[PDB]
Structure 1
Amino acid sequence: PTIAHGDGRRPSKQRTFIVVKNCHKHHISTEMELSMLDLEILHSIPETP
């Protein structure tokens, strides 16, 4: 909005402002290690205590 003055000044007409905002992409990761004895055993059926 504006203010009306009694001076002879030039009037700033109706003004509109446009502003854009963009995203930021983030990533994350980690690593594990598993021994193959564990993966192999997990599947085999146990027989002896």
Structure 2
Amino acid sequence: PTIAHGDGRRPSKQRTFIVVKNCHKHHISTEMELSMLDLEILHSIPETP
């Protein structure tokens, strides 16, 4: 922005400058250990109580 100076009468519009900045990217990886027989139970939905 700019301050309106009336004393010097040196009028100036806003000085819009442009810089550029890098976007860092990060990549985290964990593993989930699901057992086999529990997934076999989870696939075959039963009806018996």
TM-score by length of structure 2 reads 0.45
Question: Where does structure 1 lack aligned partners over 5 or more consecutive residues?
Answer: none
TM-score, L = length of structure 1:
0.45
Supply the RMSD in Å over aligned alpha carbons.
5.6
More RCO (CA 8 Å, sep 6+)? 1
Identity of aligned residues (%): 100
Displacement, 1:29?
A: 1.4
Q: Number of residue pairs matched?
A: 49
Structure 2 gaps of 5+ residues are: none
